[PDB]
Amino acid sequence: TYTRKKIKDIEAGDRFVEVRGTIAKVYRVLTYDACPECKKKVDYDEGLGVWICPEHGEVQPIKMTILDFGLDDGTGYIRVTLFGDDAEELLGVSPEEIAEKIKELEESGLTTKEAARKLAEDEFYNIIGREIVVRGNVIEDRFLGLILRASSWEDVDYRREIERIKEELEKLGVM
Amino acid sequence: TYTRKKIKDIEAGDRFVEVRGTIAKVYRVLTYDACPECKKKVDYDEGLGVWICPEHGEVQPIKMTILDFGLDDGTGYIRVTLFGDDAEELLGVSPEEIAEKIKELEESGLTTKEAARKLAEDEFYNIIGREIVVRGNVIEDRFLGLILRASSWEDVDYRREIERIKEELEKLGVM
Amino acid sequence: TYTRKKIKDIEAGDRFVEVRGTIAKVYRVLTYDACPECKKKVDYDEGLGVWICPEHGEVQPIKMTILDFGLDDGTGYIRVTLFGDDAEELLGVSPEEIAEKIKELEESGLTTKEAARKLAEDEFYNIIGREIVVRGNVIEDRFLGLILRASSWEDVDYRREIERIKEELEKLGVM
Amino acid sequence: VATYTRKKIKDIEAGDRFVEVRGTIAKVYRVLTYDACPECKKKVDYDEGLGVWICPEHGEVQPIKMTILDFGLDDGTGYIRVTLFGDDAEELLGVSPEEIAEKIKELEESGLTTKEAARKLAEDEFYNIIGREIVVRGNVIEDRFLGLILRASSWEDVDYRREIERIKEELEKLGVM
Amino acid sequence: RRRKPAVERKISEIREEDTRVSLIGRVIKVDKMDYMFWLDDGTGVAIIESESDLPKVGQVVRVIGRIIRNEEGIHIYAEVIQDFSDADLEALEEIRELERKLLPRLEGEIVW
Amino acid sequence: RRRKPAVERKISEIREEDTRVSLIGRVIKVDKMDYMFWLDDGTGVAIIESESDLPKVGQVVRVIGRIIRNEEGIHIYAEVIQDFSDADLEALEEIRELERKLLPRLEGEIVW
Amino acid sequence: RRRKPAVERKISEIREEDTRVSLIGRVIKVDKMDYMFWLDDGTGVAIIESESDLPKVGQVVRVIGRIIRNEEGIHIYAEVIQDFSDADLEALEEIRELERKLLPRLEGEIVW
Amino acid sequence: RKPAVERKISEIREEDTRVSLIGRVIKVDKMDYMFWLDDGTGVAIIESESDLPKVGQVVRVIGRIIRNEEGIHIYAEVIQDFSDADLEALEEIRELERKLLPRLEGEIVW
Amino acid sequence: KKRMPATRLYIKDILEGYFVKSEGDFEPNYLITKYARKVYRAKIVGTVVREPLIAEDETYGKFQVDDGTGVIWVLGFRDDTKFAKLVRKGDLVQVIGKIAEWRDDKQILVEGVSKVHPNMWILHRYETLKEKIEHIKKAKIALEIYNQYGITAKSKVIAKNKGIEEELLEVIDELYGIMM
Amino acid sequence: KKRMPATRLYIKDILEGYFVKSEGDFEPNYLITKYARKVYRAKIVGTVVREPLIAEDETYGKFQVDDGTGVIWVLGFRDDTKFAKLVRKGDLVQVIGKIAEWRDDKQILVEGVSKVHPNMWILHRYETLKEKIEHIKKAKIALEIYNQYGITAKSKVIAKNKGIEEELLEVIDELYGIMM
Amino acid sequence: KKRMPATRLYIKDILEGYFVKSEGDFEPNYLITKYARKVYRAKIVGTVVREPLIAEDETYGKFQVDDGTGVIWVLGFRDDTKFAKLVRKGDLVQVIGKIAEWRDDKQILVEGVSKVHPNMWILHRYETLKEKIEHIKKAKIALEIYNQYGITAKSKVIAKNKGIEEELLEVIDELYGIMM
Amino acid sequence: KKRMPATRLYIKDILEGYFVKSEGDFEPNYLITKYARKVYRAKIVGTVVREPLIAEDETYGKFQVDDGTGVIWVLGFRDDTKFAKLVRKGDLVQVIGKIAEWRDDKQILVEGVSKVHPNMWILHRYETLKEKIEHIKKAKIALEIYNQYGITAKSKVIAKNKGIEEELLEVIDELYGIMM
Ligand SMILES: [Zn+2]
Ligand SMILES: [Zn+2]
Ligand SMILES: [Zn+2]
Ligand SMILES: [Zn+2]
């Protein structure tokens, strides 16, 4: 399944990693089209004028969300990436609203990245400071270093963390 | 109760009269000694070395200020005299300060009257042009003419004055 | 001829009086036309449209100067009127120049007396304070008081005044 | 007598002598005062066991208070620390050493050490000299813990026509005028 | 070139010939980056520009200022701002009306 | 309503579209009853109308002022008056000329 | 302290306590090299320092000015020179002695 | 300012000024704005300003003691719900911190 | 020992009246307004529009006052320059003082200046209008008496029994003689 | 309508006099000298000592006058500044004008300045000495009568009988009133 | 591109810590607590005690935080004022931000505020205690090495062998220098 | 501890550059002008056009500066508000400080302000013009190297032997990446 790991010891190429932390910075919010069967990126062919998905033939794509933010737990800082319905659940805003807002921002004369960053820093600034437990895989990007791509996130279980910290206190040797 | 009268119709010997006007000159300001119970003029005896207040026996002198100015209200000009703490309130300076200033002027070789006049005309010149309402009784001094001995003074109530002027205009026959 | 008289003792109807004093105020300077040979006022008769002198027939008028000023001595103040060439000698300005100055002043919108007063108080202010001797006759005007109409004037003589005040000093009894 | 030489802050190195630098005051580090001989104006030592000040040039002398100023100079191509001694310090600041000593004493009476009192005095009362153009002269030394330091002998105000002449000459070298 | 007195006017009736005016209103919005405020006395809104000082929002002021009439608009350049917070405005308007209805007739009476 | 810079200009070269100008001149006449002075810099004379302060006669000043253009005429409403009595004017005009002849070409160089 | 009045004296009676001198006298010699001239009152000759104006021989003159007492000599730092060509000097002398006789008694009498 | 300190109502100290309580409501008086809090060791009448708790809702209150002749009542400032809570860990951590703080703060030097 | 009371005026009337300068010692200067009113001392309320100008050696001091009908200079020479320091720009003052003329332009020689509350300004407006109307009526009544009859011992009796002050006929005649 | 005459003084009499300022409107300011003389307008003769200082805007103009007895300031404000331009330093002038006080120092408010000749200056000295002597003897005559009864009807009658002008009694009365 | 992770503290650790502000451009300000811990970003949990005071032009916004050991100011300038709008008085918040000093009193420049549940607060207390204990024992075992030799290569090697992080030696040295 | 020198700039360039905000801790914010110049600190000379605005509780202070090509706001927060009190309207100041952006308008966070003589203003003009010319020439030379070849070690060698700083190529690359 998933293996618990500390941010201090995260290394590239690791798989099935569980981290707990708090959100410290939000970088990007974006939406883009994907296949309605495998939820995978579809290529808009100029010669055909349609969105081809080279695993199910021609399909009609649907919008899905991508979120880029940062996690900290007191021992390190890791940039993390959240996908699809998890981002909608975390943010609480339906994806079509994000799409409409980002087109409205880009209509003023901003590129895709500028609109994404402005939208992240101007509306979804209220999620940072909140705790989150992420499960995912560690990838290395040549320009950004370590990125934890989270398959899913689930709220912190207080009792499990309390018993973990108590057992670590026993390892310390107070009781 | 007091009666409001215009300065044009002020006659000698009238009592309990109230006058509205503007301060047009400052004649004198000075200090003297009075009883600490009745606030009345007391006599210091050189041969006895004490102050005698013949309802009070021997008492410790206290400082009382006299202010002497002139009031104008478009129809006449009349002298007004204020006593004690009312002059302290109107001038805003404690009587001990006036006493020490007049002492300092007297140490220059100037008589009492001249020192009082210079103090009035060189330090308290900023009250000229102030609009007030005084109350008191009128007396006829053989060397000065009419004098109004103020018992209390107050500030103008502008709404009542507007009411009075409106009533006068109504009697005239415009409104 | 002419008899000395103190200003304090000048009375109405007195004749042939000379005084010595100092100019204290200039009232007016004007010019008007007169008969060229006997020096008398000529009337511009509207019935004939000509200047008539009703003692010598028709004449061509010439301009002459009139000057009203004030003389003082230390014992009193009197008004003095000079006529014609005397004013020209005292001032040093030919009557025609006064004439154009008056008409320029009038063209601005001022009456004859206003122009006279303006000219007297604006350009002829430099004769005040000079010593002079006036000789003439005292007349009484109902609304103006005593006017010493001067027949002639001269610069004050010094030796005669010094000897007169010396004999007055001898009368005092110092030497 | 050796003459001084203009030199850009960019290319000055440790151990150089007689360097002249024009710049703007960008930070005030410290202002302090201490005792010195009243004749040779040199550091004298007060001995606790002897209770006197000893000048190793004149014997026993009565101490006189002189101030030291420590600031930073910037001229578009670099940033360098500068230290001013004695008379020039109160000439630049405009406050006699007695007042500085009294203020340091009052600061230390609040429980602050020497360094903290000096820094608070510099940053709380003499902050109005930042942004002033000056031309300093002195010798550049290298302190093992602070880097390059320019110890100044004298300072003067600029001279708006000579500087314009220099800029015109440099523009002529570029080839526009 | 005697300076003209401040001709006291309401916002709705600022005529074209005016070069200096004196208005009384209450502040409704203040912009500090541009140093402007909006004056509203019931019959209109005027964008009053200021040089160095601004009033607070919600208080009644009296503003004496010039007129700058260009194609950019018509904005009043405030010169003197006075705090009229506790003045009786109804009595002021009554006396303004009475003065306006009486004085033009009064000057006509008497002759030479 | 962005604030406009003081477009530095000569007296003889004041355009029609200017709204704020900065002049340098010397005073030749001052009128204290009306609070005005005459600024003369060699190529013209401008009637500068102050608000509260006046300079002396014969000293060189620099005036930053808002231009008021009505049918009455053209007159500069001084806002900031600075004393440039001991300034170097020849070097100032030389640098103004150099900047004017160089800067318009500079912006064209380089691309993106 | 107010400015002192002038005191008039003769050459032979120049007192040490006198401060400013008024003299009436005769020119006998003028030296333009040092701007100096000799003045004769009859009882002596005094050297007078003219600043810019110089009298003529044959013109009797009156000088008001300052005395300079140094080790080199006694010369009068003249301030004003005026023509008295015509003058009753005897009357001036008689009134001077008459005043010196009566004024000291006049002031003493009449108490308050 | 004075930090808020938490105890039991039966162990209220005269020297202490600001109090933090976690307790059980039994009754409430609207007209006087009183209500009763029970922490298991005693009952305290505490004065809510305008909020009013419900019976069955465990309440944590931050307030100030008003030791007058009228009784012992708490000038409550903060009222919050703790009905979904554990506290055994609360006494555990309070006693742990109390036991090890005095030596820990005295440990080491400069 | 008599002092004439000060009248409350519009600045327009001060600027449009005729200034009569006395020649004797025992008479003061005065001003006759367009509706035959002699005024010795003026008393106005208005806004200071400019910072006071005080000479470098405090010989004199002045400031401008505006009230909505005209703008007038207020001066003080020698030791009255102290008054010029009691006010600054934008204040709402009340000024009492004499009337003087200099270079065909009326000016006030200040005797006192003092700040007031806006309600005092409204009182100034009410009172000045009310006391203008009264004198307008009285002068309108007395003008007919002067025109029909003139100055006769019986004209004084008629004015006495009609309720009109005696001096009003004299000031009307003076105005006629000055503006003729 | 009465211009009561100016009087001739020494400078010290003006400087060491008693300045009495009036309070009523119909009374002018005056001076009471040491020997009980009432002075309204001074008329002095003397030489000018320094350059006339005049304001660049010609609002005020003042200069110094010296005659050997003291230094006196001659001033002219507003319109009178023209007189300050008539003089040059180093000449003898006759100055006629009023007396006023500023910063406990006497000064003359100018009304007329004229260039003069030295012989009329010695005539000035003659006249002032003679008038001083005459008033001194009159005051000496009046002193004992004042000290006899005071200001009573009998005293007035006897003063009239032996030939003393009545106002002297009041002048010494005011002098005694102000000395205390 | 490296961000130093925020560390969890009590309020008292911040209040009597030592503020060290850097002078170079490439170094941030920091804090050294009493027991020699280097702190860059604070991360506190506590209840709010007073209403958020925010300027009407929303340039600045600040509020108070209390948990049981002290009262700290949480500030936001210019753009950050939005955070001061997210809170209401009475609730428990987690605040993450930087440390800065103004008028001899520490304060936190906000970077993020989030409302939270009490069990998180108790977990916060647990984590603070755990972090305090480990570092206090590490400082205790490093004190012997520091007082033994100092900052030397042999001392660094023996500290590495004993398992003590190197930077503690320099932190101890800087704290020792700050004390004297 | 390295501090970067301040560059003398036109206000127009400050208002027309691209503001790059750092994300790490050990890097400061900066601004890239239209001609590929990285600036950390600005230093301008100009006229204060308005009275400084200081909050009632002295938490911040600001003033406007104009030099001829633009008008910029200068700010100071917390204890730097003291600087906002050193100047008044009409001054000719020199301001040194960092560059910040708020609501898409560039502003300067003040570190020092000080009055100067007009000759200093003329030096500012000369020296800023020369400093612009030099960098324009260098960037024009380096742009061709960037475009023809790219980012390689051999391109770095070419730039080294051509007399162009190494960092300029990276600055041009960043400008291209931000303007794409
Ligand atoms: Zn698919
Ligand atoms: Zn008693
Ligand atoms: Zn004839
Ligand atoms: Zn030595």
Numbering used by the authors:
A (entry chain J), B (entry chain G), C (entry chain D): 184 to 358
D (entry chain A): 182 to 358
E (entry chain I), F (entry chain C), G (entry chain F): 6 to 117
H (entry chain L): 8 to 117
I (entry chain H), J (entry chain E), K (entry chain K), L (entry chain B): 2 to 181
Paper text:
To decipher the molecular basis of PabRPA oligomerization in the absence of DNA, the structure of the PabRPA tetrameric supercomplex was determined by cryo-EM at 3.4 Å resolution. The PabRPA tetrameric supercomplex is formed by two dimers (AB and CD) arranged in a C2-symmetrical assembly, which interact through contacts involving their Tri-Cs. Interactions within the AB and CD dimers involve their OB-3 domains, while the two dimers are held together by interactions involving their OB-4 domains. The Rpa1 N-terminal domains are flexible and were not modeled in our 3.4 Å cryo-EM map. This unanticipated oligomerization mechanism is strikingly different from that observed in ssDNA-PabRPA complexes, which involve OB-1 domain. Notably, many surface residues in the interface that stabilize the PabRPA tetrameric assembly are also found to bind ssDNA. Indeed, most contacts within the AB and CD dimers involve the α1-β1 β-hairpin of OB-3 domain, which also make extensive contacts with ssDNA. Consequently, the Tri-C DNA-binding groove, which provides the main contribution to DNA binding in PabRPA, is almost completely occluded in the PabRPA tetrameric supercomplex. Therefore, dissociation of the PabRPA tetrameric oligomer is required for the Tri-C to bind ssDNA. Consistently, upon addition of a poly-dT25 ssDNA substrate, the PabRPA tetramer is dissociated to DNA-bound dimers and monomers.
Replication Protein A (RPA) is a heterotrimeric single stranded DNA-binding protein with essential roles in DNA replication, recombination and repair. In Archaea, the same function is also fulfilled by a heterotrimeric RPA. We report three crystal structures and five cryo-EM structures of Pyrococcus abyssi RPA (hereafter referred to PabRPA), in its apo form as well as bound to ssDNA. We find that archaeal and eukaryotic RPAs share a conserved heterotrimerization core, which is composed of three OB domains connected through a three-helix bundle formed by a C-terminal α-helix from each subunit.
